[PDB]
Design a protein around this ligand. Structure first.
Ligand SMILES: CCN(CC)C[C@@H]1OC[C@@H](N)[C@H]1O
Length: 340
């Protein structure tokens, strides 16, 4: 690589390691914010729009119930997410602004991105043109180059985790499965449609699983549906391990060639995991029109700008039942979350 790229990544790792070894803790509290609206809900918690009472700034507050985080690997993942997010810095990653805990919950307060999830926009339009898909894919390539150079694996790439910001660019959210890994790792995690074969087969795996998931994401953006789907996960898994994929006729030859090399079932032959690393992807013909420095500097005009009215507009997110944020009189699971 060029010396400027090598020095950029060396400085990035220096800055990450300093925050990694001295994590920030306890930088706000709950009654510093007004609650506005629930933006999403899951098995362990929810994400809410909030407004800081002194500054008037809007944020996305993720709330995790400590008593639903029971398994050893669930606790490990919860601690991974906050330690990594407070240490990273890159143009296409959502920024963590505050974190804290109380008797019942863990809290991560992020910048609020009002344009909504890529998933919503993709399902509304049907599919993205190849130049449109390529604009988003280039941002993921640069983000994985950054994360992998810090010895981080992301492990949750899917359209629901890619938010579109006020300039039409991607902000990646949800680091719940992200982990710092020297060598291999073994946990079964991720959504079935995006899982690489070596996760399904219970092997020790590495950063190659993120490049497989990029292949799935690019296919889904350009086709409108993912390459492997079925009603039961076991059926999805059979398709993934088989080594077969059918491409729509409208795909360009260059797109098909890139996807065959990302959706390579043999991890030792998969693009992103060869001796030239990420540069086999950056130099592929499908990316020949991409100005990689212009993308990083956000100087390229985006395919579209989301419609919203201001920094507190919630019209690009959907409606959920509004439930209490109960905080018990007694502390729960204090020992497990001491480092949070
Ligand atoms: C932090 C790990 N868990 C909570 C125990 C949450 C999962 O992380 C990835 C994300 N999509 C979510 O479902």
């Amino acid at each position: 690589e060029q010396e400027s790229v090598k020095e950029f990544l060396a400085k990035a790792k220096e800055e990450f390691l300093k925050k990694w070894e001295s994590p920030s803790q306890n930088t706000a509290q709950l009654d510093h914010f007004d609650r506005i609206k629930t933006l999403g809900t899951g098995s362990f918690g929810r994400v809410m729009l909030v407004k800081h009472k002194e500054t008037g700034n809007h944020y996305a507050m993720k709330i995790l119930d400590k008593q639903k985080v029971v398994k050893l690997k669930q606790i490990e993942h919860t601690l991974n997410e906050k330690r990594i997010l407070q240490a990273v810095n890159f143009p296409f990653l959502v920024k963590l602004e505050f974190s804290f805990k109380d008797n019942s919950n863990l809290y991560m307060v992020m910048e609020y991105v009002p344009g909504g999830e890529m998933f919503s926009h993709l399902r509304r339009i049907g599919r993205f043109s190849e130049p449109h898909a390529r604009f988003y894919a280039a941002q993921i390539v640069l983000t994985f180059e950054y994360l992998h150079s810090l010895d981080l694996i992301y492990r949750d790439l899917k359209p629901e985790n890619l938010l579109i910001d006020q300039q039409g660019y991607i902000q990646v959210t949800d680091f719940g499965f992200a982990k710092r890994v020297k060598g291999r790792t073994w946990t079964l995690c991720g959504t079935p449609e995006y899982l690489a074969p070596e996760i399904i087969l219970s092997k020790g795996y590495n950063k190659a699983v993120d490049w497989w998931a990029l292949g799935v994401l690019i296919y889904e953006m350009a086709a409108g549906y993912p390459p492997f789907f079925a009603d039961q996960p076991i059926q999805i898994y059979e398709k993934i391990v088989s080594g077969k994929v059918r491409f729509p006729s409208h795909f360009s030859s260059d797109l098909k060639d890139l996807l065959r090399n990302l959706l390579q079932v043999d991890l030792t032959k998969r693009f992103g995991n060869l001796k030239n690393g990420v540069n086999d992807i950056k130099n592929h013909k499908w990316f020949a029109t991409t100005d990689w420095i212009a993308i990083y500097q956000r100087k390229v005009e985006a395919p579209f700008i989301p419609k919203f009215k201001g920094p507190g507009d919630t019209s690009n997110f959907d409606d959920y039942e509004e439930e209490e944020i109960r905080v018990s009189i007694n502390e729960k699971c204090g020992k497990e979350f001491t480092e949070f």
